[PDB]
Amino acid sequence: SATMKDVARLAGVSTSTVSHVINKDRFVSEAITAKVEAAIKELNYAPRSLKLNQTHTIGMLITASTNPFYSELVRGVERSCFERGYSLVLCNTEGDEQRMNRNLETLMQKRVDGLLLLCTETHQPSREIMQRYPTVPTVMMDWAPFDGDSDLIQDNSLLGGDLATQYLIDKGHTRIACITGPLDKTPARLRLEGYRAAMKRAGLNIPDGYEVTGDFEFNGGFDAMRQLLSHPLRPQAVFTGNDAMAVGVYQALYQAELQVPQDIAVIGYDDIELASFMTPPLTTIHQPKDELGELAIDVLIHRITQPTLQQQRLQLTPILMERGSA
Amino acid sequence: RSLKLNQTHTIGMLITASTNPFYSELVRGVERSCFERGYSLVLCNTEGDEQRMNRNLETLMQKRVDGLLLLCTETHQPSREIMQRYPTVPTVMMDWAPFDGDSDLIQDNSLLGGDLATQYLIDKGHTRIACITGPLDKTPARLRLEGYRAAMKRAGLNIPDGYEVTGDFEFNGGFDAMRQLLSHPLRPQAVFTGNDAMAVGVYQALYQAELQVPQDIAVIGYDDIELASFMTPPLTTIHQPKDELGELAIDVLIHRITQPTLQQQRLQLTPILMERGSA
Numbered sequence: 213s214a215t216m217k218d219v220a221r222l223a224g225v226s227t228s229t230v231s232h233v234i235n236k237d238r239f240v241s242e243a244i245t246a247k248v249e250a251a252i253k254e255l256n257y258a259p260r261s262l263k264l265n266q267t268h269t270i271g272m273l274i275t276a277s278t279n280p281f282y283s284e285l286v287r288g289v290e291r292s293c294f295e296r297g298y299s300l301v302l303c304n305t306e307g308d309e310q311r312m313n314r315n316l317e318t319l320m321q322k323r324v325d326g327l328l329l330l331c332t333e334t335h336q337p338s339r340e341i342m343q344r345y346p347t348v349p350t351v352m353m354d355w356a357p358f359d360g361d362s363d364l365i366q367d368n369s370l371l372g373g374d375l376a377t378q379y380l381i382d383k384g385h386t387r388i389a390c391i392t393g394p395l396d397k398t399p400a401r402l403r404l405e406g407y408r409a410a411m412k413r414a415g416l417n418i419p420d421g422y423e424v425t426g427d428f429e430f431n432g433g434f435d436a437m438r439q440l441l442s443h444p445l446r447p448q449a450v451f452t453g454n455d456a457m458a459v460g461v462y463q464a465l466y467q468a469e470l471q472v473p474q475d476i477a478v479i480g481y482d483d484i485e486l487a488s489f490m491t492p493p494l495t496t497i498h499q500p501k502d503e504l505g506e507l508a509i510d511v512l513i514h515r516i517t518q519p520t521l522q523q524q525r526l527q528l529t530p531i532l533m534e535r536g537s538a
Numbered sequence: 539r540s541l542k543l544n545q546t547h548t549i550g551m552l553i554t555a556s557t558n559p560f561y562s563e564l565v566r567g568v569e570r571s572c573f574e575r576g577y578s579l580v581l582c583n584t585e586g587d588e589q590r591m592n593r594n595l596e597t598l599m600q601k602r603v604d605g606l607l608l609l610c611t612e613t614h615q616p617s618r619e620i621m622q623r624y625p626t627v628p629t630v631m632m633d634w635a636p637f638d639g640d641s642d643l644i645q646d647n648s649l650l651g652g653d654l655a656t657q658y659l660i661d662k663g664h665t666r667i668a669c670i671t672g673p674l675d676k677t678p679a680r681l682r683l684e685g686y687r688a689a690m691k692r693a694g695l696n697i698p699d700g701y702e703v704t705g706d707f708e709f710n711g712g713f714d715a716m717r718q719l720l721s722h723p724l725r726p727q728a729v730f731t732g733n734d735a736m737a738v739g740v741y742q743a744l745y746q747a748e749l750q751v752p753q754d755i756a757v758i759g760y761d762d763i764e765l766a767s768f769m770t771p772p773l774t775t776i777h778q779p780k781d782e783l784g785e786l787a788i789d790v791l792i793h794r795i796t797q798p799t800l801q802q803q804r805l806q807l808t809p810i811l812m813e814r815g816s817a
C-alpha cells in the first residue's frame with residue numbers, strides 16, 4: 213500500500229532522492245538519510261562489490277588532439293588501471309555533439325564500471341547519455357565541461373599561472389605577455405587570472421593586447437605570437453598557456469629571427485616530454501600527470517565500491533621546471 | 539550488409555602506449571574512417587610483458603568487437619588459448635606485422651621511403667650521410683635502412699663504420715643516436731633520422747653540440763607528423779599518408795568481416811618527400 217512517493221511526501225524530499233536513499237547509489241546528507249529512513253519506518257515500506265552489470269572495466273572518453281599532453285595523461289591512467297587490476301577501454305571523440313554522443317553511448321554499451329572524461333574546450337557529451345547509465349560514476353579530469361555533482365581531478369592552474377608569471381617577474385622582466393587557451397575552457401581562464409594576480413602584486417601594468425587567445429595547440433601559439441610581435445611595445449617575455457602553444461611561439465620567433473631567451477624569454481605549461489627537447493629546453497610548469505591519473509583512478513574505484521562517497525574536487529599543486537628558455 | 543546477432547558494429551584497436559605523435563595521428567584517421575562507415579572504435583593500450591598484453595587483448599575480445607586492428611611497437615605472439623576462444627574475429631595489422639601470420643597488412647612503402655630520403659640528400663650534394671634506424675627487430679626500420687643502403691650503393695658512396703646507428707623511434711633514441719654519430723672523428727654532413735620523433739632528439743643533440751641545421755648538418759626525417767612543420771628549422775621529411783592508411787585498413791577489415799574467405803591483403807601506400815628547411 214506504500215510507494216516511494218508516499219515515503220517522499222511524508223519525508224518532504226523528492227522521490228528521486230528517496231530512490232537514492234534506498235539504493236545507496238549516490239551521496240545523500242546524513243541528515244536527510246535518517247529522515248527518509250524515518251519515513252520508511254512508520255509507513256512500513258517494502259521495496260556492493262558483487263553486481264551482475266559490472267565487468268572490472270573502466271571506460272575513458274578522450275579528445276582527439278595533437279597536443280601531447282593528452283597522450284601523456286592517458287598513459288598515466290593506463291598504468292594506474294593495470295596496477296589496480298582494472299582493464300581500460302578508450303574512445304577518441306571529435307567533431308560535433310551528436311558525434312560525441314554516439315561515441316559515449318557506444319562506450320557505455322560496452323558495460324564499463326566507471327567513466328573518466330578528458331574533454332577539450334567547447335565539449336558537452338550529453339548528460340542524457342550518462343542519465344541512461346545512472347549506476348555508472350563519472351570522474352572528470354582536468355576540467356568540468358558542464359559542472360554537475362561529478363568528481364573532478366585536476367591541477368591547480370590559478371596557482372600555476374601565478375608561479376609562471378612570478379618566475380618571470382623574479383628574473384627581472386616587466387613587459388610580460390600572456391597567451392591564453394580558449395577562455396571558455398576553465399584552466400585557460402584560471403591561468404590568465406594567475407598571471408593577472410602576479411602582475412598586480414608586482415604593480416606591473418598589462419598593456420592593451422598583451423593578453424592574446426590561442427587554442428592550446430601548435431597553431432594557436434604561432435598565430436598568437438605573431439600578433440604579439442606586431443605590438444609597438446614589444447614583450448620581453450611571454451607566458452604561453454601550454455607547451456603546445458610554446459612550440460608555435462618558438463616557430464614564430466624563429467621566423468622573426470629572434471633568439472630565446474636573449475631576445476624574448478618563454479615559459480610554458482604542462483611539462484610535456486617535448487619541452488625538455490626544445491632548443492632551448494623549455495622552462496614550464498609541470499603538471500604531475502602520473503599522480504593525476506593515479507588519483508583519478510583511485511577516486512573512481514572508491515566511488516565504484518562506495519557510491520555514497522561525497523563529491524571530490526581535488527587539485528594537485530604544479531611545479532616550476534627551470535630550463536633555458538627563461 | 540549482414541544481419542548477425544553476434545556482431546556489434548564495433549572495431550577494436552590494440553595500440554602501443556608510445557607518445558610518439560605518429561600513432562595518435564594515425565588513430566585519429568582510423569577513428570574518422572570508422573565514423574564515416576558507421577562503426578564505433580574501441581581502443582586498448584598495451585605495454586611490455588606478454589601477460590599484460592594478453593589481458594588487454596582478452597578484454598577487447600570480451601567486449602565482442604567485429605574486427606581487430608593492431609598498431610604495435612613491441613613484438614608479441616598472441617596466446618593460442620585466447621585465439622582458440624575467439625576464432626571468428628579477423629585481425630588487420632597496421633604499419634608492421636608484430637608476428638608472422640596470414641593476417642592482412644596495411645602500411646606505407648618504407649623501402650622506397652628510405653631511398654627517397656637518402657637520394658634527396660645525395661642530390662643536395664652530401665656524401666657523408668648517416669642513418670639513424672628504428673629498432674632492428676622492427677620491419678619498417680630495417681626497410682628504411684635498406685632503402686638508404688640502396689641509394690648509397692647506386693651513388694657509389696661509401697658508408698663509414700658506425701654511420702648506421704640504432705635508435706628506438708622516440709625522442710630519446712634520436713638524441714642518444716646523434717650523440718654517438720657526433721663522436722665519430724669523420725663527422726657526417728647529413729643524417730637520415732628514421733622517424734620525426736628521433737629527429738626531435740637529433741635537433742636537441744645538435745643544439746648542444748653547437749651545430750646549426752642545415753648549415754652544419756642537414757636532417758631529413760620520416761612520417762611528417764604535425765610537429766615537423768613547426769620545428770626550427772621546419773623538418774624535411776617523408777610524408778606517410780596516415781588518413782589513407784586508416785581508411786584502407788578499415789575498408790579491408792570491413793571487407794574481411796563481411797567476406798571471411800577473402801584472400802590476404804598486403805598493401806603498401808607510396809610516401810612523399812616534403813621539402814622544408816632542414817635539408
Ligand SMILES: O[C@@H]1[C@H](O)[C@H](O)CO[C@H]1O
Nearest residue numbers: 281354399428454481482
Ligand atoms: O590542463 C590542460 C593542459 O594544459 C593542456 O595542454 C591544455 O588544456 C588544459 O586544460
Ligand SMILES: O[C@@H]1[C@H](O)[C@H](O)CO[C@H]1O
Nearest residue numbers: 560633678707733760761
Ligand atoms: O611507420 C612507423 C612510424 O614511422 C613511426 O614513427 C615509428 O614506427 C614506424 O614503424
